Design a binder for these strands. Structure first.
Ligand code: MN
Ligand code: ZN
Lengths: 335, 369
DNA sequence: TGGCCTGTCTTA
């Protein structure tokens, strides 16, 4: 795992904490710019090209049948196999939380244009949230989305302008979501007692593993690991969760896929005052510590760090500038 | 006594999502924004009043003027019938505040503009501010250490205030003046927003856009060709719906077709403004046009359609020199109020006609002025 | 390889 500094072009200001990267056919794209989209790029979606350790953001266009979704911070995203991306939730430039679901696909590639379609949701729609997970599980030749966790504003009855921005963890209900028709079913599980946000999520076959996270009520970053199995018979699905020992304690960690069936997670925040400098390896479930990479002193002495998974087993991370550039960016590679 | 949070009051019906506690003063401008290392990074410190409590303190501050104005209109001190308070709402960034890196600040403030009382079925004014634009009557509501173009932070900090003001738009305020309970109801008019902040809070594009007006849907080309017949069209609701249209692309149009459909509204509005004009800018826009007309009438540009840059420059120099000799006007390169005030005179037109050959065009320039 | 449409920086 080698660390590499990156320089950025004129629109470095667009990058902010909560951004996302999506990988389409080896090409990387960036979503969730700071501010509302400007005339220079009306969609807010960018080709994310790092050539010779230099990052260029190039405007991407949407198809005629697309939504123009707002930039979103901390939405739950996953990849769905045409190959497409699922966006649910997030914060808007106006600080509203979106409950909507957007679906991204490559509509046309000339020398890329995207199709962005919103899927309406009925039934037990999850309250709009950020900092939550969504993945796709496969059971008996059927595909279903699993959504869990996060935080949101207070409900309209208790919300008050003096604490207008105050947040609480969402109730820890598992949500099954059929993307074709847009339906949602909520499952209360006895093993999931507390709320959780900014956790890590790993989906394999009919299972989703939940790692780390932060629970607001206790203000604990629990060192538990949860396995979630989903069976899809012809009738109503069945979901069963089990607690597993050996769970790491980390919030806002980043996750990437090395080779096949091996995942590595690079640090997040282990305590409010402390940062998780170590890295973990998950084999599909067993967790082993890895040799910590050659962090520079700037990374070591920063209080805040943020990043995203690029797709190619490589992480794109960023650190805040000195008091006297706004951000300094690095790329950490694996495999 | 003079700070918000001292006198008791009531809202009927109680304000939606606003505490009824009346002993609240200075409160954190972040309004409970999460600050953990996981959440979005908060780079700002701000402090505010709860908008209602501040209205209460400002009215109690002006109690003496209200009673005396009631007297001055030949009305009784003890009347309590519904007073209507008009309130200019205002917002500006304050540039660099730093004491010595730039440290920018936003000030959200209000001004009590007028207070009328209802006697029978005549609305008689009991008070109106003599100096609306003074720093002195601009009551501060929130001060923050942030960039007016830092949209995420701005909405995060201002949105609770707007929520409170929305709440007050449909409620009556009961407040004790001079032993007698009096009842107030408010009309909020966000007229204090310069163009940049209007565009930012109403979901519109940046100032270079083709949609040049925040009152109408004209384009720069339309407004230039169509000189005068334009009407005020836009409203906050129309802008919230035009945003939703941009967002939903219901007729599956291309980005240029969609942009023409929503006439510039590409972001979601979050403040209702009353965009106006400054008398200064009327004078300045007119004077700029007259200056160009003067220099072009000296160069006689109709006869020289392919005139080069340097010929027009010498035209400008000619006009500058002659205006310095005749009107004592130091040519400047940035248009301002005093230049406009001295140039927009009939005598200045006579002076510039002294350099124009055709007197038929003297007729036209003088009538224009 | 441009006009040149857009956003940043400069000077009165
Ligand atoms: Mn301003
Ligand atoms: Zn207009």
């Amino acid at each position: 795992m080698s660390l590499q500094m990156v320089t950025v072009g004129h629109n470095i200001a667009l990058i902010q904490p909560g951004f996302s990267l999506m990988n389409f056919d080896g090409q990387v794209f960036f979503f969730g710019q700071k501010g509302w989209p400007k005339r220079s790029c009306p969609t807010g979606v960018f080709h994310f090209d790092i050539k010779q350790n230099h990052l260029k953001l190039k405007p991407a266009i949407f198809s005629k049948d697309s939504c123009y979704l707002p930039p979103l911070r901390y939405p739950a995203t996953c990849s769905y196999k045409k190959h497409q991306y699922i966006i649910h939730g997030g914060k808007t430039p106006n600080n509203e939380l979106s409950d909507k679901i957007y679906i991204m696909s490559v509509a046309c590639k000339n020398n890329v244009t995207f199709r962005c379609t919103e899927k309406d949701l009925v039934g037990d729609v999850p309250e709009p949230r950020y900092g939550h997970s969504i993945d796709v599980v496969y059971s008996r030749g059927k595909s279903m989305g699993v959504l869990f966790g996060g935080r949101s504003y207070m409900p309209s009855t208790q919300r008050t302008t003096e604490k207008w921005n105050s947040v609480a963890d969402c109730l820890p209900h598992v949500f099954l979501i059929d993307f074709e028709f847009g339906c949602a079913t909520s499952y209360i599980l006895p093993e999931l007692q507390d709320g959780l946000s900014f956790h890590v999520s790993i989906a394999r076959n009919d299972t989703v593993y939940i790692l780390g996270g932060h629970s607001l009520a206790s203000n604990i970053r629990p060192a538990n690991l949860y396995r979630i199995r989903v069976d899809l018979p012809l009738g109503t699905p069945a979901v069963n969760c089990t607690v597993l020992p050996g769970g790491i304690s980390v919030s806002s960690a980043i996750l990437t896929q090395t080779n096949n069936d091996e995942f590595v997670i690079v640090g997040g925040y282990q305590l409010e005052n402390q940062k998780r400098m170590v890295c973990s390896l998950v084999s599909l479930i067993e967790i082993s510590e890895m040799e910590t990479p050659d962090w520079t002193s700037d990374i070591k002495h920063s209080k805040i760090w943020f990043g995203s998974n690029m797709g190619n087993g490589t992480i794109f991370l960023g650190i805040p500038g000195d008091n006297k550039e706004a951000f300094y960016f690095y790329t950490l590679r694996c495999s | 006594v003079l700070l918000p949070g001292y006198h008791p009051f009531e809202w009927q019906p109680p304000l939606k999502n606003v505490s009824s506690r009346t002993d609240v003063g200075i409160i954190d401008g972040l309004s409970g924004l999460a600050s953990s290392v996981d959440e979005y990074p908060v780079d700002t410190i701000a402090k505010r009043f709860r908008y209602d409590s501040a209205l209460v303190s400002a009215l109690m501050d002006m109690e003496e003027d209200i009673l005396e104005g009631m007297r001055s209109q030949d009305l009784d001190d003890y009347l309590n019938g519904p007073f209507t308070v008009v309130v200019k709402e205002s917002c500006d960034g304050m540039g660099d505040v730093s004491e010595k890196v730039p440290e920018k600040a936003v000030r959200f403030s209000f001004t009590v503009m007028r207070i009328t009382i209802e006697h029978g079925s005549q609305n008689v004014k009991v008070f109106e501010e003599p100096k609306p634009n003074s720093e002195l009557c601009c009551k501060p509501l929130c001060l923050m250490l942030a960039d007016e173009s830092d949209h995420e932070t701005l909405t995060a900090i201002l949105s609770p205030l707007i929520a409170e003001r929305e709440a007050m738009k449909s409620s009556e305020l009961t407040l004790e003046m001079g032993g007698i309970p009096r009842t107030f109801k408010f009309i909020f008019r966000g007229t204090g927003y310069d163009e940049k902040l209007v565009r930012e809070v109403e979901g519109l594009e940046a100032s270079g856009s083709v949609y040049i007006c925040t009152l109408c849907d004209t384009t720069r080309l339309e407004a230039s060709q169509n000189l005068v017949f334009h009407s005020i069209t836009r409203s906050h609701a129309e802008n919230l719906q035009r945003y939703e249209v941009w967002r939903s692309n219901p007729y599956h149009e291309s980005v240029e077709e969609l942009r023409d459909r929503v006439k510039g509204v590409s972001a979601k509005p979050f403040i209702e403004t009353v965009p106006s004009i400054d008398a200064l800018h009327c004078d300045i826009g007119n004077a700029a046009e007259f200056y160009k007309i003067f220099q072009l009438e000296i160069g006689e540009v109709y006869k020289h359609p392919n005139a080069s840059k340097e010929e027009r420059k010498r035209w400008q120099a000619t006009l500058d020199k002659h205006l310095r000799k005749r009107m004592n006007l130091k040519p400047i390169m940035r248009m301002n109020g005093n230049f406009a005030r001295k140039l927009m005179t009939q005598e200045t037109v006579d002076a510039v006609c002294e350099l124009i050959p055709s007197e038929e065009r003297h007729e036209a320039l003088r009538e224009l002025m």
